[PDB]
Design a protein around this ligand. Structure first.
Ligand SMILES: *[C@@H]1O[C@H](CO)[C@@H](O)[C@H](O)[C@H]1NC(C)=O
Ligand SMILES: *[C@@H]1O[C@H](CO)[C@@H](O)[C@H](O)[C@H]1NC(C)=O
Ligand SMILES: *[C@@H]1O[C@H](CO)[C@@H](O)[C@H](O)[C@H]1NC(C)=O
Ligand SMILES: *[C@@H]1O[C@H](CO)[C@@H](O)[C@H](O)[C@H]1NC(C)=O
Ligand SMILES: *[C@@H]1O[C@H](CO)[C@@H](O)[C@H](O)[C@H]1NC(C)=O
Lengths: 395, 395, 395, 395, 395
């Protein structure tokens, strides 16, 4: 006729059409829907709430048996666009959502002459998947997205795949590499789900496996620790009898304590998780306690409290074994008694000074030996940590 | 006829159908709705606002007397799917909500040939239930969800249970165990509610009882306290006459004060609640005050202010009772007077030195005794705390 | 007829019915709406924004002159349920709202045979009312909720009360007592409001008077202050010539300064408000300044700078009035000159030592007197504060 | 007729009425809309985002040429209420909005017999206006709200004023005075806006001028500064040779540095703004640096390093000009040589003591002079600041 | 006819009009849409989320072949306004959005007699574009906005430009210059996009290039660093044997450490980014470590531990090369032996004092030399930094 073809085709197709009925001529034949998903970015990964926010492009197609026409008529039209609200649409959802998707509405769909109906839409998904932070900097996380019909059983709707699963898992075409997380793979799988023995449903589960870039957090956590390790080393270099060594040690301990306290609230959030970063912190913690205890012991040994002479049993071997063995390095009577009083006073003063000499020397030797032992221990621990990092990196 | 069965059945059912009228042939017969709920996860538990955010799967069914047909006709169809907006739907809500549920819309329901109508939907519930944190790490919380019709009375709508209450309370089939909270049970109950003496309503109350995992918070709260207890012990080991003991004690007190101040804002929020964690903090608080007072007293006794000799009454028993009892461990006259001047000066200097000797020894003995007493007290308190934790754990 | 009664009654009532017209046969007769409100909980009280978030159950009724029928017909039906969107509904709002209510939609209302139309709905109200925190822990707050028609004047719609105002103000049936705030009363009042001399409106103002529970904040604010008051007392007990007293005082002052700085941002928010808690803080502030000034003065008096002897005018009464009055407590010539040199040197050394004696004793006496005065002042201030708290509590 | 008048009038008016067409008989005549706005409260002023959140009551009117009727008919009805969605409504918006208004929908409007159509609605406006904080405590801010038609040009719609601009700017009838900001005026203006040379539009710009109450922030910023100024004064009162003066000064500097650091993030947010509060802080900053430098210089001059005698050139005038000028205030030979050894030793010791005497006295005099100079400088600065505050206050 | 023209024109145009069909007489001819965008403000730039929030004014036009009429009829009307929902509207979106735009709805569009249809609307865009902070204060950022049809291919819809691209990039007519960011340019480009080899699409990409104002952050980051550099200088001026130098250095180090820790969380957020501000911080970090090490070494050399005399090999050149070379600056026997005892004691005391003399002088000379070297190094570093800033500024 003289009417435009795209008008009369739509008039013929949409005439006496019911959108509330499943478009099958036989009710015993299920409606097959084929879907696929392409990842766009990882918006957010919240560990304290275990919430994954992501952006996907999702397209699906199915067959409508009431939307067929002869191509020879209506001016050779193979396909056209039809409003979404005027046709039947399956209710495909995800079981893992926790927030309603704030996605825009697409008001048009393709309709072909064979009954093929296709739908494209973006989806902002806020789902909940379990997150493990046992190795927090180097964690690899899998999350599940389960597409299924919320109401219809497997006797009415199953879900298939638009493309082969081999090429779906290795698309990575439009993913945003810049960010905190890096996508590894998206593995699809089909399953039959049934809580009851009564009804059965068909589900398509996508396992999204992603990895976290550790470049920033590793250095941001390791730099101040080794930095104050060096500061502690120059604190050891100090003399023990100055008296400010204890204040220096407690000031450094306060600084690192407040640093770790205000750091440990940000990254750690999982109740069941226990990262080895805490083990590293506890080891450093203990090394600082040993340092403080050694400093206190040396200060107590060096300090003067009118103490007695060094007891010989240790002394006859201690000074000997730290050189070339381990560390290579009438009026006259009254006048005489009167002057003897001052002589005795100065003699006992000199004896006290000599005792202080010997105790100070012993304390210095012990401080040197303990400093050497601590330095060797720190070097060994640093070597172990760096070789563990290397054996991770080489893989 | 030649028309498809699923089309003509829907046309016959939805013809001259009013969705604004209760579907009963007799107005004196109430409409019975049977509901059930399955828990999916505990999204959030806010104590400062007393807000519970949870995710449930809720399904209900009822009977429609205007949606019946003969199975022999319309090609043997026992049941079909009908749009939700084209039929009457009861207004079942929860009295405890504080935020509108951001749940998606399910546009289809099942309709059977006997008038059976079923509805499935997910619900994100943000309700308000009282929370008690008297024993915060080991708290067990019950919350109430009251499903009822907001307008219709018991003469029109009651609520029943789809399944037996015995199997409802022990489902736990799809609950997410990973998280902060662990679900214990969901007990259902039916009640008649009436504020006025005028109208009566039927309500279904679900008591959700859940438990909190204490593994993280307990250690995160107990570790720094005992850690600085050890640091305080090495502070006690110090000599009292060094002069830096008071600075060390006040620095440790400042550190633990700022730590507790910046910790006590996060977890404690309830105005009426008073956890025993505060009691533990106050006991440690007092133990630190006793420690500081003992240190100040020892410093005051040890310090030199040109004080007099130790008064004998205490001295004749104090030094004796701390060994093997408790702690086992002319020109000539002018010259003579001139030299006697220096002799007297040095004699009084030696007397001052001896007095300082004796006072220092007394202070050292007292410091040792108080250190022993403090150590025994700390060990006893630690034993009591650990045995209380054990008697909780064994239950 | 054979048609079901609930169907034909609705068909007769809703036939040729216009929902956009006020349902009055005479346009000169205003439509009377009777409303009432029941409080459920106090969700939030924000002082920095002066925002009150609350939850109410609100029900209203009016008369529709186009919804009447004979009870004898339609099978003895006195009342039924009708969709809300198919009938005229007045636009009753609150003038004080600042956020749109996120309340669910109730799609049904009661309709009686006399034209009685009733509506029930919950309302989450986010309004703005002035808050005064002059006595912040013990504040009693009134807020206003003004229900009125936004467009219709008093010639069309007034608002009445469903129940007597005597029983409305003392309902408190479903209020949640657990929380931060406690409800006292809800007083209703009717008023005529008119900005212009042109149009007049009818308004129903509910004054909600509530009270705040002070059990938590009072102790949480008073505990650390008195705690460090005790710590300051043990700091006073210290000797003045030790040299670490000034460091102790400034460390305590820094601790309380940082504590008050990080506390004063949370609770105080009102610009015009000035709580007496700030007055208490300022008084403690000044007492600490007096303490520091006394410590500095005593240290300056005690310290040795090769100063001269104590000037007699004060000394002849100062030491006397602090005991039993207030505080009860040739070769020979060369040799002689040579030895006289040492004699003079030791004599002047002894004179310096005696001067240091006397100045130290004077400083100790002054320190004791000032410590007694400070202790009496603190005890008096504590007595005044506790008796003020008691005279508030007894009321 | 016997039909109710309010029903038949609405039936006659709404019959064959098109709401999608501008209601003019001649297309060349523009439609005039008269609007006005009344301010209710200032909800929020965000400086870091430059966002103004406010609440207004907005009413407008226009003329509809298809809604006229004879008053003599339909029972003397001059005006009625009509649903908003059934009539044409102009699209008047604000160009400055950044967030969609969360305002409720008013479903009724007045219609008069002359075609007068009136509309009332509340509006929660979240707009963006430039904020200047050059004088942050005493800033007066103007913001612009531009009402205009988003699509229609000036050939179709202009905007006029309901009332005279003289009485609009001085309404202030329902404004909430309690809060942070105080409203000064609302000045209206009419303008023609055109980006292109093609189309022209009519706009109504309201300039809202408001003022900020400075009572809280001024005292909250000035109190701790002067407080620690007093504490610094008592620090100056200390002796210079005690050795704890440097620690006191650095502790006070650390306290004020951390205070200013944790304060400067809250109020200052504008990148281009530079308040004079920063100038005050920098001046105090420098005064503290001068204080620390003076303390270090005095400590260096006073300290003992076995230094030599005070060089006479300064000494002969320095001590003189600070009193009453500025500051008013054989065997015998062996024995003789042997004793001469001790005599020389004690003589050189006495010489060192005398040199220390003189250097200590010089340091004390210099410290007193610098303390006087610093006190005079602080008093002058305080006088200047208080007289600047007074000359602002008197205006 | 006597009917109003604007009514009958709309009746003729909207009669039997289908809004669900593409308005083309021939299905082989694509529909061309011409769009343009004008920037209004940069609302937000979030680096941790890489989110750009902006406000644009967007207008588009196309041709409708079913909306044509003869101008001679309907009273000379060239154009009119038509509701948006009654006509076909293309689905043009942006691929980069992450949040649904909260923009208001414009319910009217222009329709001309030639089929020209125009649409104007504001858009609040929340998109995701990569942000690089390698030079954070002086960063220039490009972001992409890709307008395309979400469903229709290039065989149905392409996108053109309303204006020439030369004048689009340099509009900057209504942009808000006040703020954090400054707009540089908006470059448009047309592209054909196709993931598959199957379908092709037309896209219009706008590259928005903007710049950040560095005036605030630069000074706010450089001021405290140089400030405490000056404080460190006055710390160097101190004597080394006082004993409080180490405490001063560690207090300053603690202050700058806590400052940098609480600053480094705000601005730095990108994982892959590494600003040179961190390099500046690390250089200052190292300079402070060198300062502390020098102070510790000088303190260790100066301190007295009853050490021996200065070993001559260094001493014979060290003191010489730092002046005018680099730094210009019977009874008798018993009595004799008795007195010889005191003579020997005082001789050895004098020898110890002389040794302490020499070691103190050597330490003072070394401290002066290291202070000079450190001052020269700091001056050189400051010169390098200021000349780098100058060579950036001149460009
Ligand atoms: C739906 O598809 C699955 C595999 O994709 C298949 O196993 C199942 O049999 C299909 N459903 C029916 C009813 O055949
Ligand atoms: C509704 O059910 C309850 C128990 O589920 C029952 O007690 C009540 O009688 C029922 N309602 C009516 C009107 O019978
Ligand atoms: C509406 O009610 C008030 C009191 O509730 C009454 O004073 C007023 O007269 C009533 N309105 C009319 C038009 O009578
Ligand atoms: C609209 O009003 C303005 C002043 O309010 C006037 O200048 C303008 O001419 C009016 N529009 C027309 C088309 O006359
Ligand atoms: C759409 O426009 C582009 C350039 O704007 C042009 O290259 C393309 O050919 C056009 N589409 C068709 C179908 O011609």
């Amino acid at each position: 006729t003289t009417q435009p073809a795209l008008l009369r085709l739509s008039d013929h197709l949409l005439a006496n059409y019911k959108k509330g009925v499943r478009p099958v001529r036989d009710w015993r034949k299920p409606t097959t829907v084929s879907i696929d998903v392409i990842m766009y970015a990882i918006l957010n990964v919240d560990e304290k709430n275990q919430v994954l926010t992501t952006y996907i492009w999702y397209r699906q197609y199915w067959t409508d048996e009431f939307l067929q026409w002869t191509p020879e008529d209506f001016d050779n039209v193979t396909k056209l666009s039809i409003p979404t609200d005027s046709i039947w649409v399956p209710d495909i959802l995800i079981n893992e959502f926790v927030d309603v998707g704030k996605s825009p509405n697409i008001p048009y769909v393709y309709v072909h002459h064979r009954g093929e109906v296709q739908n494209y839409k973006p989806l902002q998904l806020v789902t909940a998947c379990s997150l493990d932070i046992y190795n927090f900097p180097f964690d690899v996380q899998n999350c599940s997205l389960t597409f299924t019909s919320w109401l219809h059983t497997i006797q009415d709707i199953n879900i298939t795949l638009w493309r082969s699963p081999e090429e779906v898992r290795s698309d990575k075409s439009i993913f945003i590499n810049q960010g905190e997380w890096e996508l590894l793979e998206v593995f699809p799988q089909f399953k039959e789900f049934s809580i009851d023995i009564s009804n059965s449903y068909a589900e398509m589960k996508f396992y999204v496996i992603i990895r976290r870039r550790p470049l920033f957090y590793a250095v941001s956590l390791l730099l101040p620790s080794i930095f104050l390790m060096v500061v502690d080393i120059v604190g050891f270099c100090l003399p023990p009898d100055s008296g400010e060594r204890v204040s220096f040690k407690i000031t450094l301990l306060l600084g690192y304590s407040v640093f770790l306290i205000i750091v440990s609230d940000t990254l750690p959030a999982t109740a069941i998780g226990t990262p080895l970063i805490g083990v590293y912190f506890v080891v450093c913690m203990a090394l600082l306690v040993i340092s403080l205890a050694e400093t206190i012991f040396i200060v107590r040994l060096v300090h003067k409290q009118d103490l007695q002479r060094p007891v010989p049993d240790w002394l006859r071997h201690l000074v000997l074994d730290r050189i070339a063995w381990i560390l290579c390095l009438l009026a006259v009577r009254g006048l005489l008694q009167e002057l003897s009083s001052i002589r005795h006073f100065l003699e006992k003063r000199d004896e006290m000074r000599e005792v202080a000499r010997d105790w100070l020397r012993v304390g210095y030797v012990l401080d040197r030996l303990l400093f050497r032992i601590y330095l060797l221990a720190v070097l060994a621990y640093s070597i172990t940590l760096v070789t563990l990092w290397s054996i991770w990196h080489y893989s």
